[PDB]
Design an enzyme around this catalytic site. Structure first.
Site, PDB file in Angstrom:
ATOM      1  N   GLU A  76       2.790   3.978  11.023  1.00 38.92           N
ATOM      2  CA  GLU A  76       3.812   3.361  10.249  1.00 38.92           C
ATOM      3  C   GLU A  76       5.451   3.426  10.937  1.00 38.92           C
ATOM      4  O   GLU A  76       5.519   3.754  12.047  1.00 38.92           O
ATOM      5  CB  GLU A  76       3.832   3.913   8.809  1.00 38.92           C
ATOM      6  CG  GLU A  76       2.493   3.187   7.914  1.00 38.92           C
ATOM      7  CD  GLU A  76       2.811   1.689   7.818  1.00 38.92           C
ATOM      8  OE1 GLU A  76       3.872   1.569   6.792  1.00 38.92           O
ATOM      9  OE2 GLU A  76       2.135   0.968   8.187  1.00 38.92           O
ATOM     10  N   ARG A  77       6.095   3.047  10.031  1.00 38.09           N
ATOM     11  CA  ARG A  77       7.763   2.857  10.225  1.00 38.09           C
ATOM     12  C   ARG A  77       8.245   4.545  10.185  1.00 38.09           C
ATOM     13  O   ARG A  77       8.058   5.246   9.247  1.00 38.09           O
ATOM     14  CB  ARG A  77       8.401   1.932   9.402  1.00 38.09           C
ATOM     15  CG  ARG A  77       7.625   0.817   9.185  1.00 38.09           C
ATOM     16  CD  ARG A  77       8.400  -0.028   7.955  1.00 38.09           C
ATOM     17  NE  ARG A  77       7.809  -1.506   7.945  1.00 38.09           N
ATOM     18  CZ  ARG A  77       6.652  -1.830   7.829  1.00 38.09           C
ATOM     19  NH1 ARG A  77       5.762  -0.752   7.338  1.00 38.09           N
ATOM     20  NH2 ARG A  77       6.233  -2.906   7.853  1.00 38.09           N
ATOM     21  N   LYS A  99       0.859  -1.239   0.034  1.00 38.93           N
ATOM     22  CA  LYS A  99      -0.030  -0.026  -0.106  1.00 38.93           C
ATOM     23  C   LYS A  99       0.750   1.313   0.031  1.00 38.93           C
ATOM     24  O   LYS A  99       0.421   2.394  -0.709  1.00 38.93           O
ATOM     25  CB  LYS A  99      -1.049   0.092   1.255  1.00 38.93           C
ATOM     26  CG  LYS A  99      -1.605  -1.179   1.513  1.00 38.93           C
ATOM     27  CD  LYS A  99      -1.847  -1.435   3.116  1.00 38.93           C
ATOM     28  CE  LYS A  99      -0.403  -1.311   3.864  1.00 38.93           C
ATOM     29  NZ  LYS A  99      -0.537  -2.565   4.631  1.00 38.93           N
TER      30      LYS A  99
HETATM   31  N1  LIG Z   1       3.797  -2.667  -7.446  1.00 36.13           N
HETATM   32  C1  LIG Z   1       5.051  -3.348  -6.707  1.00 36.13           C
HETATM   33  N2  LIG Z   1       6.202  -3.792  -7.123  1.00 36.13           N
HETATM   34  C2  LIG Z   1       7.209  -4.197  -6.443  1.00 36.13           C
HETATM   35  N3  LIG Z   1       7.192  -4.355  -5.221  1.00 36.13           N
HETATM   36  C3  LIG Z   1       6.022  -3.806  -4.472  1.00 36.13           C
HETATM   37  C4  LIG Z   1       4.797  -3.455  -5.208  1.00 36.13           C
HETATM   38  N4  LIG Z   1       4.038  -3.093  -4.366  1.00 36.13           N
HETATM   39  C5  LIG Z   1       4.478  -3.495  -3.228  1.00 36.13           C
HETATM   40  N5  LIG Z   1       5.777  -3.999  -3.175  1.00 36.13           N
HETATM   41  C6  LIG Z   1       6.261  -4.432  -1.863  1.00 36.13           C
HETATM   42  O1  LIG Z   1       5.810  -5.282  -1.269  1.00 36.13           O
HETATM   43  C7  LIG Z   1       6.612  -5.344  -0.071  1.00 36.13           C
HETATM   44  C8  LIG Z   1       6.176  -4.641   0.943  1.00 36.13           C
HETATM   45  O2  LIG Z   1       5.529  -3.327   0.201  1.00 36.13           O
HETATM   46  P1  LIG Z   1       4.758  -2.219   1.206  1.00 36.13           P
HETATM   47  O3  LIG Z   1       4.390  -1.054   0.412  1.00 36.13           O
HETATM   48  O4  LIG Z   1       5.541  -2.431   2.162  1.00 36.13           O
HETATM   49  O5  LIG Z   1       3.650  -3.110   1.579  1.00 36.13           O
HETATM   50  P2  LIG Z   1       2.873  -2.681   2.719  1.00 36.13           P
HETATM   51  O6  LIG Z   1       1.300  -2.855   2.540  1.00 36.13           O
HETATM   52  O7  LIG Z   1       3.095  -1.512   2.716  1.00 36.13           O
HETATM   53  N6  LIG Z   1       3.718  -3.207   4.093  1.00 36.13           N
HETATM   54  P3  LIG Z   1       2.973  -2.740   5.387  1.00 36.13           P
HETATM   55  O8  LIG Z   1       2.772  -1.240   5.652  1.00 36.13           O
HETATM   56  O9  LIG Z   1       3.871  -3.197   6.341  1.00 36.13           O
HETATM   57  O10 LIG Z   1       1.674  -3.534   5.725  1.00 36.13           O
HETATM   58  C9  LIG Z   1       7.833  -5.081  -0.583  1.00 36.13           C
HETATM   59  O11 LIG Z   1       8.459  -4.246   0.188  1.00 36.13           O
HETATM   60  C10 LIG Z   1       7.961  -4.564  -1.785  1.00 36.13           C
HETATM   61  O12 LIG Z   1       8.233  -5.556  -2.865  1.00 36.13           O
HETATM   62 MG   LIG Z   2       1.611   0.977   5.104  1.00 32.95          MG
END
Ligand SMILES: Nc1ncnc2c1ncn2[C@H]1O[C@H](COP(=O)(O)OP(=O)(O)NP(=O)(O)O)[C@H](O)[C@H]1O
Ligand SMILES: [Mg+2]
Ligand SMILES: Nc1ncnc2c1ncn2[C@H]1O[C@H](COP(=O)(O)OP(=O)(O)NP(=O)(O)O)[C@H](O)[C@H]1O
Ligand SMILES: Nc1ncnc2c1ncn2[C@H]1O[C@H](COP(=O)(O)OP(=O)(O)NP(=O)(O)O)[C@H](O)[C@H]1O
Ligand SMILES: [Mg+2]
Ligand SMILES: [Mg+2]
Lengths: 484, 469, 53, 483, 116
Positions: free
Chosen positions: B183-184, B157
Site C-alpha cells: 500500500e501507500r 477497503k
Molecule cells: N464509507 C466511505 N465514506 C466516504 N468515503 C469513502 C468510504 N469508503 C471509501 N471511501 C473512499 O473512497 C476513496 C478511496 O477509498 P479507499 O479506502 O482508498 O479505497 P481503496 O479500495 O482503499 N483505495 P485503494 O487502496 O487504492 O484500492 C476515497 O478516498 C474515499 O472517499
Molecule cells: Mg488498500
C-alpha cells in the site's frame, strides 16, 4: 548400488530430479534421506523426476534417495469408519493407527461392461426438491454444480446426515456408508464439518479423507483416487458407499500444477491435455455391481464450482458430460428464497424414476415437465399482457409447487412426509391458499396426518406404493384438512 | 564455521549463488551479502543442481558483481517476537525502521512455519458487533474469525478497515498487529500518526499495537514476504502468550501479485491470466496460518484487492474460500454515493444463522435481501421502460428497496473529510429494529433522501423533518 | 385533446428511449471490444504455455 | 586478456547483446560499445552478460570490444538543468551547450520510507476551477490524469506548469514549485511546440524537460521517467519544491512490454509482464512530502494514463490508480459537448488534497461535489414531467457548470474564484441569461478590481473567511446584479 | 426436390419459414406482447407454436422419462400431416394436442380426449 538408490541432482518447487534409481517403478514411492516421501512420475533416460509429499527445504542436492518398492496405495476396510485420514490414509484426527482389512491401489480399473446391473435402489437424501425432482440411485454418479457459496456442500451434507435412518439399524443391505473427500478446503473448514457430523451422530458411518489447501499438490490430486478405493471396498463386499468429491475443480487446479511443473505441455486454460481422462476414470469407478459380484454399489456426488454461472467453461463441461445428471444451484434463486437453490429447469437425474420410490413416483407424475411449462408461462408473463384462465391457472400452481419444494437445511424428510405434500400440491389442493402461508401449511399438515391418519403414513412407508384405496384415504384426508 | 557462496548470476530480483562444497543452504533460508550500505538479504528459492541455488533478493540488486561472497545464515528470515515489538515499526526482514534503536526481544523466529494442524483446530460462533449496519445486519463478523474486504481500486477497503480499527481496536484490550502490504507509505505514515494520537501507540508508555510495513515501493521479494513477518509476530501473541489478537492485513492481494512478478524469472510456465502456477497452495500456506487455534483466538480483517474490478480473477476467486465473512465493495454503489459501498447481495457470513443471531435478525435479513434482489431483477425493465410499466406490488418493492439501499449507507467518523457529516455508529439491536420497521412499511411516507447517509432509524425521522422545512 | 396529448407524450418518451439505448449501445460496444481483445490474449497464452513445454 | 573493464560481443539481436567477460561488471551498470553506442548490464550469468542496447542493433557487431563505465545508470542533477531540454541520459539536446550539473543521482534510487515523511498540506494551485475546487492537489501528492486520447490531458498538466509563474517570480523561496516534464513516447514535433509554448509563457526559465520520443530506444523511453525522477528529486532533497509530470505512463509501460517480451518473460494480462505494476509503483513512490526534519522538500507526480474507449477498468489504469493518490478522469463525451476541462466528477477524486486546499474556497463551496455529481443523474432522467422541486435545482446545476467553463491559458487566482462560487451556490446569477454567464464573469471582475479591492487583498493575504468578509461581499454581489 | 419431390421440399421449406418468422418475432412478443401484431403474423405464430410441438415425439427408448409409449411415424404420414397443418386445416385444435404424439391421427385423438 544405483539400482535401489539415487543421488539428488537438483531440487525446487516440490520437484526433485534424481540420478539413479535404476529399478524404480513408474509411480513408485521413494523416501529421501531427510525423511520426506515422494513419488516418481517421469522416468527419463538420464534421470528420474519426483514430486514430493512434503516441503523441500529439507531436500538438498546430492542427498541420497531410496526405493520403497511400492506403487501408491491405501488401507481399506470398515476400520476406516469414523476416521479422518490424509490422502495416503494416515490418521490425522488423533485416534491412533488405522486397522485395515487390506490395501487397494489409488488407480484401479473400473468394473467392466460385464459385472454390472441397472440402478434400481434409491439413495434417499431426504431433500424434497431432490427426492421428487432428481431422484438419486445406488450406483449412479450425480454432479452437484453451481457458483461459489451456493449450497453445493450443504446438499451433499444433508444427504449424508439422512442415512442415520438406516445405519442405526441392522439390515446391512439398506445401509449407506459415506466417504467425504475434502479437496483444497482449509483445515478448519474440514473441522467445522466433522464437528457437525458428530453433532448429528453421523461420523460413525462416514470416512473423511482430507487433502487440505496447504498439502502437497500430489496429495490433492491423489485424494479422490485413494478415497474411491476406500469406498470401493464397500461396493466389492456387498455393501453400499456414497462418495462426495468436494471438489473436482480444485483437484484439476492441483493436477495442472504437477504438470506445469513437470513441464508437460499444457492444454486449454493451462490444464493438461487429459484433464478429462483425470475425472472420467475416477467417476466411472462408481457403479452398481451384479448379483454374481455381490450387488454392492458405489455412488458418487462430485462437486464442481463455476464462475459467473458459466457452465461452458472447461472443467464443468467435462464432468457434466461424464455424469448421470446434474443438480444446478443458483445464487439468484437462493437470495429470493429458494433453498435448496436447486434449478429444476437445468437439474436432471438420468436414472430418473428407476431410483425413486413407487409412491413418490406415482404422485410426482409429470411434475418436472410441468415445472418447465411453468417457467414457460412465467416468461410470457413478463409481457404483462392480460392472462387467461389457463395460464393464470398454471401460474398459480407452479408458484405454489415451487414454494412447496423449498426446504430448510439439516431437515431431511421421510418419504411418507414427502408423499402427501407432493400429492396436495399436484392434485391442486394447495391452489387456494396464500403463498406466504404455504410455509405453515407443510408442518401443520404433517402434524395432523401423524396425529390422525398415521395408519396411512405407516402404510406408505412400509409398502412404498399407493394402492388405489390408499389414494382414496389420502384424497379424503387432504380435502378434509384444507377446509380447516 | 561460516558457509560462503559465490554470486554466479544476477537477473532483476533473482540472484544465483554457487556453494563450494556439499552442504547447500536449505530452501527458504536467508543469505547475506555485505554491502557498503549495510547488508543485502536473499531467500533460497530453489536448488538448480550442481551446487548452485537460486535466490530471491529481499532488496535491490543494483551493484552486485559476479563472483561476490555470499554468507549463509542457516535459517529462514528471523523476526523479533513478543511484547518487545509493541509500538515498534518493523521490516520484512524483522528490523526496526522507526528510527528508535534495536528491538531487544528474547527470541527471533523464522517467518516460515507450518500451519496449525487439524487436531489443533478450534471453532465457535460468537458475533462481533461492529456498529456497521450493512455488516451487523447482513453479514455479521465473528470473534476469532477471518474477515475480508473485497473491492477494486478506490471503492474503500482502507477507510472501511480504519472504521473497524476505530471501533473494535479501542475497546479490545488485547494486542493488535497491523501489516501494511503493497500500500501507500503515506497511508502508513498516517497510521503511525493516528496511533500516537489515540494513544494506542505510546512511545513513552505501553502499546497495544505493532507495525510491519512492506509497502508498494518495495521490490517483489520484500512484498512477497512482509505478510509472513506480520503473521509470525501475531502467531507468537496467540500461541505463546495466549492472547486475543486483532490482525489487520492491507492489502493481502499484493502478496499474490508479488508472487507472479517473480514467478517467470524463477523459470515457471505461467498459468491462467499469467499467474504463478502455485497461486493456490502459496496462499494456502499463508492463509491457513492466519487462524484461531486451541491455544489462542485471532480475529483478522484482511483487505482484498480485485484486479480490474473482476471478481473472478484467479487471485480473489481463490481467497474467498479462506474467509468466514466476506464483504464486497461495488464501484457502481460508490458512484451512487452510497458508503460504505458494500454489496448487500454479494456479502456473506457463516454467522448469519438463526442459531447465532436469532430468528428475527435472521428474517429481517432475508426479507431485506429478497427486496434488494427483486429491485436487481427489474434493473433491466426500469432501464428501458422505466417505473410506469411495473405492476403495483413491484412498484412498491422498488421504492422500498431504494430506501433500504440508501439506509445501508452510513457516515464513518474516519471518512469525515469526505462526507462532512460527523460519523455515526449504530448498534446491532438498533440496526435490526430500524430495518424491520421499514420492511413493515412503517416509513413509506418518507422521502428516499432521508434514508441516505445517517445513523439509525431516529436519524431518518430527524432529517425528514429538517427537509420538510 | 386527451389523445393528442397522449400521442405527444408517446413521441417524447419513445424519443428518449432511443437516446438512452443509444448511450447504452455505446457502453456495451466498448465493453465488447475489451472482452474480444482479452478473449484473444487468454486464448493465446494457453497455446504459448502449451508450446514452451 | 584483462576482461574486467572489457568484454566481447558473442551475439546481438532484438535489442540485446550477449557480451563475453566483463567480470568486474555490476548489474545495471552502463557499458559503451566499439561504435559509442551505450548499453546496460541487464543480467549477469556465469559465462556471459546480457546487455540491453540504448539504440539500433545495427550499431553493434558480434566480436566488438565493450567497455565498462563504472556508473550505475545515472543522470546529471541540480539547479543548472533548468531552462534546458535533455534526453533519458541527461544528455543536452537543445544544443544549448553542456549540461551544468551539481552532481549525479542514480536513476534507481529508493523511496523515502515511513518515517522521513509528512502529511501533504501546501496546495499546488492549478488555476483550474474544476480542479482546485473539486479535486485539489497538495505538494507531494501524486495525482493521476486519466482520459481518452484528445481529452485535454496535457492541457490540464501544461496549464499547471503555466500557473506557477505567479509564485516562481517573487522573492518567496517556499512558494516556488519547479516543473519537470517527461515526454515519454511523444513526437519530436509535439515536444518542440510544447517547449515553444513554455517559452512563449516564459515558464522555461523555471522548468526542465526530459524527452524520449517515439523513435528512441525502448529502454530509453523506459528509463526516462526514472531519470527525470532523480532530477526532480534534487529539489525535494534540498528543501525546495518540484512538480514532475509523467506524460505518459501508458507509453512507458508499453516500452517495458517491449524489452520484457524480447527478453522472453511470460506475458500476463494484455501481454504485460507481471511486474508492470512495480514499474510505476516504484517510480511514483518517490514523489513525496518530507518531514520537518528533512527540510520539508516536496515532489508532485502528475502522471498521465491514456485509456481506450473510456476504459477505467483496464489492467494498466487500475494499476496506476491503485498506486496514485486519486485521479482526474477526463471523459470524452463531455469534451465532445464542449465541456472543458471535461472532468467527470463521480470518477475523479483527490484523496489527500481535501485537507491541503485553500480555506476560502472550501467555505464557499459547501458540498459542491456531490451536488453536481447527483445533478448529473437527475438531468439524465428529464428527457418526464414538470416538477418544480428538481426543476428549480436544475437552474443551478446548469449555471454552475456554465460557471466552471474555463478558456485555455486562463489561470484564475483564488480570491477571484471565491466570489463566483459564492454567487453560484448562493444563486445570485439565476436571473442572468444562460448565454450571459461566462460573459458576466469578465464584467464582475472589472467591477471588483477597483471597488471592493480589499476583499481580494484579504483573501490573498489570509486565504480564510470571517463572517466579517461574508456580508462585506454579499453587498458587492447583488449590487452588480442590479447594475 | 430432385430427391424427395417438390411437395416434400415445399412443405419442409414452409415449415422452416414459419418457425424462422416465429423466431424473428419473439422480440416483439416479449416487448409489446402478442397484442401488437399483424393478423397474418398472429396466425403465423399460432401455426408456428402448433408446429413446434408436432416435431416432438415419444421415443420408445425414452419411456423411462415420459412414461408415454413410443410412437413411430411413417415418412408419408409426416409430410401429409405437416402439409395439412400448414394450410390451416387444423387451426382450431389447441396447442397441447400436437405435443408428444405420433401422426395427425394422434392429434385428433388427443384433441377430443382432452376436450372430454
Ligand atoms: N464509507 C466511505 N465514506 C466516504 N468515503 C469513502 C468510504 N469508503 C471509501 N471511501 C473512499 O473512497 C476513496 C478511496 O477509498 P479507499 O479506502 O482508498 O479505497 P481503496 O479500495 O482503499 N483505495 P485503494 O487502496 O487504492 O484500492 C476515497 O478516498 C474515499 O472517499
Ligand atoms: Mg488498500
Ligand atoms: N437450505 C439452506 N438454508 C439456509 N442455508 C443454507 C441452506 N443450504 C445451504 N446453506 C448454506 O449456504 C451457505 C454456504 O453453503 P454451502 O454448502 O457452503 O455452499 P457451498 O457451495 O458449499 N459454499 P462453498 O463451496 O464454500 O463456496 C451457508 O454456509 C449455509 O447456510
Ligand atoms: N479547455 C480547453 N479549451 C479548448 N481546447 C482545449 C481545452 N483543453 C484542452 N484543449 C485541447 O484539445 C486538444 C487536445 O488536447 P490535449 O492536451 O492534446 O489532449 P490530449 O488528451 O492531450 N490529446 P493527446 O495527448 O493527443 O492524447 C488541443 O490540443 C487543445 O486545444
Ligand atoms: Mg465447499
Ligand atoms: Mg498527452
Amino acid at each position: 548400488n544405483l539400482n535401489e538408490t539415487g543421488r539428488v541432482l537438483a531440487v525446487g518447487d516440490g520437484i526433485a530430479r534424481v540420478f539413479g534409481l535404476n529399478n524404480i517403478q513408474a509411480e513408485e514411492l521413494v523416501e529421501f534421506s531427510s525423511g520426506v516421501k515422494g513419488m516418481a512420475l517421469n522416468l527419463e533416460p538420464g534421470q528420474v523426476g519426483i514430486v514430493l509429499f512434503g516441503s523441500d527445504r529439507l531436500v538438498k542436492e546430492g542427498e541420497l534417495v531410496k526405493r520403497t518398492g511400492n506403487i501408491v496405495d491405501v488401507p481399506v476396510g470398515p476400520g476406516l469408519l469414523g476416521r479422518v485420514v490424509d490422502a495416503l490414509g494416515n490418521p490425522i484426527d488423533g485416534k491412533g493407527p488405522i486397522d485395515a482389512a487390506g490395501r487397494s491401489r489409488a488407480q484401479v480399473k473400473a468394473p467392466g461392461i460385464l459385472p454390472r446391473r441397472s440402478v434400481h435402489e434409491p439413495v434417499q437424501t431426504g431433500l424434497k426438491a431432490v427426492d421428487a425432482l432428481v431422484p438419486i440411485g445406488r450406483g449412479q454418479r450425480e454432479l452437484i454444480i453451481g457458483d461459489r457459496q451456493t449450497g453445493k456442500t450443504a446438499v451433499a451434507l444433508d444427504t449424508i446426515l439422512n442415512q442415520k435412518r438406516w445405519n442405526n439399524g441392522s439390515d446391512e443391505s439398506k445401509k449407506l456408508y459415506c466417504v467425504y473427500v475434502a479437496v483444497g478446503q482449509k483445515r478448519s473448514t474440514v473441522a467445522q464439518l466433522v464437528q457437525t457430523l458428530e453433532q448429528h451422530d453421523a461420523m460413525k458411518y462416514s470416512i473423511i479423507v482430507a487433502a487440505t489447501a496447504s498439502e502437497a499438490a500430489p496429495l490433492q490430486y491423489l485424494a479422490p483416487f485413494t478415497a474411491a478405493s476406500i469406498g470401493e471396498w464397500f461396493r466389492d463386499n456387498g455393501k453400499h458407499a456414497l462418495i462426495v468429491y468436494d471438489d473436482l475443480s480444485k483437484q484439476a487446479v492441483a493436477y495442472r500444477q504437477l504438470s506445469l511443473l513437470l513441464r508437460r505441455p499444457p492444454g486449454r486454460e493451462a490444464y493438461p491435455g487429459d484433464v478429462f481422462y483425470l475425472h472420467s476414470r475416477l467417476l466411472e469407478r462408481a457403479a452398481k455391481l451384479s448379483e454374481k459380484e455381490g450387488s454392492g454399489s458405489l455412488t458418487a456426488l462430485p462437486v464442481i464450482e463455476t464462475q459467473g454461472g458459466d457452465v461452458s467453461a472447461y472443467i464443468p463441461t467435462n464432468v457434466i458430460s461424464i455424469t448421470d445428471g446434474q443438480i444446478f444451484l443458483e445464487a439468484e434463486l437462493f437470495y429470493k428464497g429458494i433453498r435448496p437453490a436447486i434449478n429444476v429447469g437445468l437439474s436432471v437425474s438420468r436414472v430418473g424414476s428407476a431410483a425413486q420410490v413407487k409412491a413418490l413416483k406415482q404422485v410426482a407424475g409429470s411434475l418436472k415437465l410441468f415445472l418447465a411449462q411453468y417457467r414457460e408461462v412465467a416468461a410470457f408473463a413478463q409481457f404483462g399482457s392480460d392472462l387467461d384462465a389457463s395460464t393464470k391457472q398454471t401460474l398459480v400452481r407452479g408458484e405454489r409447487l415451487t414454494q412447496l419444494l423449498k426446504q430448510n437445511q439439516y431437515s431431511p424428510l421421510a418419504t411418507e412426509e414427502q408423499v402427501p405434500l407432493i400429492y396436495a400440491g399436484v392434485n391442486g389442493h394447495l391452489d387456494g391458499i396464500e403463498l406466504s402461508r404455504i410455509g405453515e401449511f407443510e408442518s401443520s399438515f404433517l402434524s395432523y396426518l401423524k396425529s390422525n391418519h398415521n395408519e396411512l403414513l405407516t402404510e406408505i412407508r412400509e409398502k412404498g406404493e399407493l394402492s388405489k384405496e390408499l389414494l382414496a384415504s389420502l384424497k379424503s384426508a387432504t380435502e378434509s384438512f384444507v377446509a380447516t | 564455521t561460516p558457509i560462503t557462496g559465490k554470486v554466479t548470476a544476477v537477473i532483476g530480483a533473482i540472484v544465483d549463488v554457487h556453494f563450494e562444497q556439499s552442504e547447500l543452504p536449505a530452501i527458504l533460508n536467508a543469505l547475506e551479502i555485505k554491502t557498503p550500505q549495510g547488508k543485502l538479504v536473499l531467500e533460497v528459492a530453489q536448488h538448480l543442481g550442481e551446487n548452485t541455488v537460486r535466490t530471491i533478493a529481499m532488496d535491490g540488486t543494483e551493484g552486485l558483481v559476479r563472483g561476490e561472497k555470499v554468507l549463509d545464515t542457516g535459517g529462514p528470515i528471523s523476526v523479533p517476537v513478543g511484547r518487545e515489538t509493541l509500538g515498534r515499526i518493523i521490516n520484512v526482514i524483522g528490523e526496526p525502521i522507526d528510527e528508535r534503536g534495536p528491538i531487544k526481544s528474547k527470541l527471533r523466529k523464522p517467518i516460515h512455519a507450518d500451519p496449525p494442524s487439524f487436531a489443533e483446530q478450534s471453532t465457535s460462533a460468537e458475533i462481533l458487533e461492529t456498529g456497521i449496519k450493512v455488516v451487523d445486519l447482513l453479514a455479521p463478523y465473528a470473534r476469532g474469525g477471518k474477515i475480508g474486504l473485497f473491492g477494486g481500486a478506490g471503492v474503500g477497503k482502507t477507510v472501511f478497515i480504519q472504521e473497524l480499527i476505530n471501533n473494535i481496536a479501542k475497546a479490545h484490550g488485547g494486542f493488535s498487529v497491523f501489516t501494511g502490504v503493497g500500500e501507500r507509505t503515506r497511508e502508513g505514515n498516517d497510521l503511525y500518526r493516528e496511533m500516537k494520537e489515540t494513544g494506542v501507540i505510546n512511545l513513552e508508555g505501553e502499546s497495544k499495537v505493532a507495525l510491519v510495513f512492506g509497502q508498494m515501493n518495495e521490490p517483489p521479494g520484500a512484498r512477497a514476504r512482509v505478510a509472513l513477518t506480520g503473521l509470525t509476530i501475531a502467531e507468537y501473541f496467540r500461541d505463546e502468550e495466549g492472547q486475543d489478537v486483532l490482525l489487520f492485513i492491507d492489502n493481502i492481494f499484493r502478496f499474490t501479485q508479488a508472487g507472479s512478478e517473480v514467478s517467470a524469472l524463477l523459470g515457471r510456465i505461467p498459468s491462467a491470466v499469467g499467474y504463478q502456477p502455485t497461486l493456490a497452495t502459496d496462499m494456502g500456506l499463508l492463509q491457513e496460518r492466519i487462524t484461531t487455534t486451541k491455544k489462542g483466538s485471532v480475529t483478522s480483517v484482511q483487505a482484498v484487492y480485485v484486479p480490474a474490478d473482476d471478481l473472478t480473477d484467479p487471485a480473489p476467486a481463490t481467497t474467498f474460500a479462506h474467509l468466514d465473512a466476506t464483504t464486497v465493495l461495488s464501484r457502481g454503489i460508490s458512484e451512487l454515493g452510497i458508503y460504505p459501498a458494500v454489496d448487500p447481495l454479494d456479502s456473506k457470513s457463516r454467522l448469519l444463522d438463526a442459531a447465532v443471531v436469532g430468528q428475527e435478525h435472521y428474517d429481517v435479513a432475508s426479507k431485506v435481501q429478497e427486496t434488494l434482489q427483486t429491485y436487481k431483477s427489474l434493473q433491466d425493465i426500469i432501464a428501458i421502460l422505466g417505473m410506469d410499466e411495473l405492476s403495483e406490488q413491484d412498484k412498491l418493492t422498488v421504492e422500498r428497496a431504494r430506501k433500504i439501499q440508501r439506509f445501508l449507507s452510513q457516515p464513518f467518523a474516519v471518512a469525515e473529510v469526505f462526507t462532512g457529516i460527523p460519523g455515526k455508529l449504530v448498534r446491532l439491536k438498533d440496526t435490526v429494529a430500524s430495518f424491520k420497521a421499514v420492511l413493515e412499511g412503517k416509513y413509506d411516507n418518507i422521502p428516499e433522501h432521508a434514508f441516505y447517509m445517517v445513523g439509525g432509524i431516529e436519524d431518518v425521522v430527524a432529517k425528514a423533518e429538517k427537509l420538510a422545512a | 385533446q386527451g389523445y393528442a396529448a397522449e400521442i405527444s407524450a408517446r413521441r417524447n418518451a419513445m424519443d428518449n428511449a432511443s437516446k438512452n439505448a443509444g448511450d447504452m449501445i455505446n457502453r456495451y460496444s466498448i465493453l465488447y471490444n475489451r472482452t474480444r481483445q482479452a478473449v484473444i490474449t487468454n486464448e493465446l497464452v494457453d497455446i504459448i504455455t502449451g508450446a514452451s513445454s
